[model samples]
Target: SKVKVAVRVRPMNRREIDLHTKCVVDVEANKVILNPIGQPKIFAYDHCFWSMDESVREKCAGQDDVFKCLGENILQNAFDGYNACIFAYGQTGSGKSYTMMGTADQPGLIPRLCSGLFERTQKEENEEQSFKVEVSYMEIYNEKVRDLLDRQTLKVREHSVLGPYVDGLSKLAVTSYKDIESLMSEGNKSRTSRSHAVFKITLTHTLYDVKSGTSGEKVGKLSLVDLAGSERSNINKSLTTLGLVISALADQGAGKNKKFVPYRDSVLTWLLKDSLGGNSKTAMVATVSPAADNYDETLSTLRYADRAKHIINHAVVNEDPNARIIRDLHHHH
Candidate 1:
C-alpha cells in the first residue's frame, strides 16, 4: 500500500549454554513476541517471517516471496510509468545485505527484481511501445557517497523539485538483465563487504529468578547469528541517518503542514527520497536477531519497523516512456 514494514526473524547462530539464562523472543504466526518478560511487547508488521520456520518463510518470506509480494506489483507501476523502491534495513549481519544483494546460489531480491523487470518489459510490449531502463549503484559509508561503477566519490546535492542527488554519480543505461548483472558486479567490486557474523547458536540464555529457581531461555538468531561479532564496528555509517529519515517522514506524514523530509542527511536516504515518502511505493524489510545480548539493537530495529508502518505514501504513475520514443521516431522522419 504505502510505507510497508515486514519483519523476518533470523534463526539462532551461536550457543552459550550457562545452563542458566533464557530467551525472551517468541515467534508466532503474524507477530514477534519480544520481552517475554511484558505487555505491548508484540510487534506486528505488514508481514512476519518466523524464525526456525523454514518451510513457511521460504514459501511466504523467501527471496521469491518478496518479489511476489512487492516486486511484481512495483514492476506493474513501472510499466504504468510509476516509480517504486524496496529497501532492506537491519543490523550488520542481520540479513540486510543478503536480502537486498542476495547470493548467487540463493539469488536474493535485486537479481530477481532485475530479471523480473526485464521479463515484464518483454511480455508487456508490442510495436507500439518501447522501453528504456537505467541503473545506478552508490555506496553510503562514512556519510560519503561513492558511485559503485565509476569508482568515483561525489558530493550529495539537492534540487527543489528533484530532491537530493549525487552530483557526479553514474546512472547507466541498461538494455538487458546481463547488462544489469555486469554493472552490479563492477559496482560491488568497488564496495567493501560489511558483516557481523552471528553464525550459529549452540546456547540460549535462561532468565531465572535465582530466588525462584525458574530458568532456561532459548534465543533464536539468523544465518548471521550463533557466532561471535566480526572484525568491523557494529556502527554502520548510514544506520543512524536512515533512522532520522524514517522518523522525519513518519512525523511529516501525520501533520497538516507537511514538512520536508531531510533525505539530504545520507547518500542512501538521499537517493531514496521519493521512495521513502514521495511518489513511489516503498517497502521495508526489518530483519530481526533473537540474541538477548543483541536485544537493544534488535529492539531498535523492530521499533524502526513499527514507526515506518504508519507512513502513508502518495504515489503517481511516472508517465509513458513508450509515449516519448514513438514521438522521437516521427520527429526524426
Candidate 2:
C-alpha cells in the first residue's frame, strides 16, 4: 500500500512571532492550506496535525493525538506480524524532533509506541502465547553506522536469508517500558553529533496449539527513524540523495517498468531500502513551520510528502512457514 503521510504545522517560534511573521499555513481537517503570495494551495494527506495553537481546540493535536493517528497503526502492524516504520522529515528545527522525540513532560511517538506495545502484550497474552521485545539503537554519520547502545562503530552486512543488518549492534531485551526508558536515555546521552537516529524494535511471538500439538513463531520489526535536517546546507548530501531515491521510487510506483532506484547512493537511503518501498508498512511525518518566511521550505516539504504518497510498499506478514495461521482469531475476542 501507499506510504501514509502526515503534515504537522508547528507554532511560530519566538523570533518569527516577534518579527510579526504572518502565519501562512492552515490545517483544516486532513487538508493543509498554504497561503503564499497571491496564490493558495491545498494538499490533503492521511493526517493533518494543527499544533499551532488552541484557537480551535478540536483541531489542536498533541503528542498523544499524533500517536493515536499514526503510531497506533504501526503497533497494530507489528502485532499482525508485519514490518513497520515511521520517519520524521522536514527542515532543521521545524518540529521534526518534537514530533518524533518530544519533551520529557510531553513524551512523543517513540515512547508512546513502546509503552503501548508492552501494555498490549500484557493485556492480550495468554498461556499458549507470549511476546518478547528487543531493541537496537544506532546513528548514521558520514555514511557510517554507529551503535548508540554499545558506543561502537558497526558494519552493515547483508545475509543470504536476512536482508541488510548492522553487524555488532546490541539488541537488548526488555521486560518492561522502564527498561527501554533507561536505555533510550543512555543512548541520548551519548548522542554527540548531527546524524540520523534509528531505533529498531523486534517483536517475536511464540505460540502453541494444545489441540493440534503444534508450535509456531512470528517476528515483526518496527523501525523508528529520526532523520537529519533537510535544509540546504553542509550536511545535506544525504538529504538530496534521499530526494532522488524518493523520486525514483515514485516513478516506479507510477507504472515505470522496474525503474532504477538509487537506494545505495546514500547510506541513509540504503539502510532504509526496505522501508522505502519494500516489505514494510511505512509512514512519513512531514513537519513544517507556519511562518510566512518559511513558506518555501514548507511547500517543499509538503511536495516531498505528496510524492511519497505514491510509493507503494508490499508488506507481508512475517510468520514462520510451519506456524502459519490466522492468529487474530486466537486472540481473546
Candidate 3:
C-alpha cells in the first residue's frame, strides 16, 4: 500500500492579519489550489483539511473531523495487527502541533485516537479475548533521543529479533484512557519547542480458541509523531536527513530499483524507517499557512507532500511467532 497524505490549511493568524496578508490558498474537495488568481497550482491529496474562520469558510474541519478522517484509520490498522504511523510536517507556527496535539479544550488526533482505542477495547474484550496497551513518549533533539517519560537520554540500538529500538526507553502499561491522558500531559511538560516528539503505543491482542484449547497473540505498534519545523537554514541535521530519505524512497518507488535510503544518517529517520516505506502503514499530515505572505514556505510544504505521495509501503499482520508455536503444540497434543 502507498502512504496516505493529507494537507491542512490554517486561518490567518495575528501576524498575518497585522501585515494585511491576503488569503491565497483554496481547497476544493481533495485538491489544494495555490495562488488562485495568479498562475494557480493545484495538488490533489487523500484529504485537504480546512480550518479557517467559520463564517467565511465553506467547510471547516474541527479537531473531531480530522480525527475521524485520519486517526480512525491508524487505530483500525493497529487492531488489525498492522504497524501504523502518522506524522505532522510543516514550518513552525503552521498548525503542525495544533493538528497533531491541539489545546486542552479541543484535543487533537493523538488524544482522540487514544480515547477511541480504549472505547473500542472496553466493548470488544471478552473471556476468550484480551488486549494489552503500553506507551512510551520520546523527544529527538540535535540527533539525540530523550525519553520524556523517564527524563533520561536513550541510545538507539538494533536487535537481531526486535529490529531498531531505544535501548533504555521506558514503556508503561495503561488500563484506561485517563491513564494515557495523564502520561501524555506529564510528557508534554518535558517537551521542548525545538524538538520532535514521538508517542508510541504497543497493542497486543490475545485470543483463545475454545475447541483447540490454544491461544494466539498479535502485536501492533502505532507511532504518533509531531516533527520540528522544516525551515531551510535552520542548521538541523535530522530534518535534512529526513528530506533526503523521503526523496530517496520516492525515487525508489519511481523505479530506481533499490535506491539507497539514508535512514542511518539521522536518528529521526532511523527510528521511523519502517514507517517511511518498510513494513508499516503510514500517513503524513502537511499543515500550511493560508496567508499570501507565507507563499514560499507553503509552496515548499506542498511540494514535499507531493513527493511523499509517491512512496509505497508494505505492511503485514504482526502475529507473534512464539504464540504460533504454542498453538501448534496444543494442536499436536
Candidate 4:
C-alpha cells in the first residue's frame, strides 16, 4: 500500500522561537499545542521559512485534536491495507520533543495515541476481541544504533514485514497502561542525556508501537521521533561535524550521485531510513523559533522540509480488527 502524510505544528512558545521557522509555521497552522510559555535554556542556530498571513493566527490545537483530522485519513488508507508512520522533525531545541512526548498533564501525540489505542482495545474487550501492544526504542549515535530499551549496540537491517529497518532494538510487551508507563520511564533513562555549556538536552526521539494483544500479531507501528537539533554546530565544536554531515545528507537530491552518501552518517537519519522515505505514513512538524536572530537557521529548516516533502513515501496502516479481541475471547468466550 502507498503511504499517506499529515503534519501538525506545535504552538509557538519561547523555546520554539529559538529552534526554526518551520516550527512557527506549525504553530500558526494550529497543528499541536504547547505548554510553559517561556524561553528554553537552549539555543538554536538554524532558520526555516513559511508564507503565512494574519487570517491564520492565535490558535491552540492538541496532539489528539490534530490526529482526529489526520488519523482517520491514514486509517482509511490502511484499511485498504497500507503502512503508515508519523514522525516529528526539526533542529534541536525545537518543540519536536514537546509535540512527540508530551506529559499526562499535557500529553503529546505518543501518550495520547496510547490512550486512544487502549480505548479501542477496551471497547473490543467485551466483544470476543483481544489485542497485543509492543514497543521498540533505540537511538543512532555517531552512526551506531543503540537500543534505548537495553542500552545495547544494534544495527539497521531488512525486515520481511517492514522492509529495511533497525535491528537489535528493544521491543517490550505491554499489557496495561501501567506497563506502558513503566516502559516509557525506563526508555527515558536509557536515552542519551547531557548538559552542554550552551544547551542541555530536553528532547530525544523514542519509537513505540501498539499491536494485537491476543494473537501476538502485528497491528500497526507508530514512531514518535523527536529528531536532534540540526543546528548543533552553531552552538558547539563537538557537534560541528555531526551537524555538517546531517546538512550534507539532507541536501542530497534525486540523483545517482546523491545516493552514494549514507544517511547512516547520523544515527537520527539511519534509524529513520524506512519511515522517512519508505512505505510508512509519515508526518513531520517542523519546529522553528520566532527570534529575528534565528532567520538563517529557520530558512535552512524550511529548505530541508521542502526537500523532505518531495520524497516518495508509501503509507502503511495497522488495521487488524481481530488483533484487538483475543484476550476477551479467551476469558469470556
Return the top candidate by lDDT. Answer: 3
State which candidate has the highest TM-score.
Answer: 2
- CA shift of 135, model 2, Å: 0.4
Q: Per model, state how many residue pairs clash.
A: 33, 0, 0, 42
Per-residue lDDT for 264-312 in model 4, tens only? 5444554456655565665555665544445556555554554555455
* lDDT of residue 144 for candidate 2: 76
TM-score of each: 0.74, 0.93, 0.92, 0.62
Question: Candidate 4 — what's its lDDT?
Answer: 0.47
At residue 102, candidate 1 shows an lDDT of 69
lDDT tens per residue, model 3, 1-333: 988999999877777778888889899999998994259999999999886573423223477678889999999999888999999999888888888888786678998889999998898898666899999999998778889887357888877677788888999999999999999999999876668999999999887766666788988899999999977433387898889888888888788757778887878898998999889999999999898867888999998898898999999989877456654554676
lDDT of model 2, residue 93: 80
What is the full ranking by TM-score, best candidate first? 2, 3, 1, 4
RMSD of candidates 1 onward, in order: 16.5, 2.5, 3.5, 10.1
For model 1, how does the per-residue alpha-carbon lDDT over 8-63 read when each residue is reduced to its tens digit? 67665545224323565666866888884345388888777654533544533577
Better of 1 and 3 by lDDT: 3
Q: Of the candidates numbered 1 and 2, which has the greater TM-score value?
A: 2
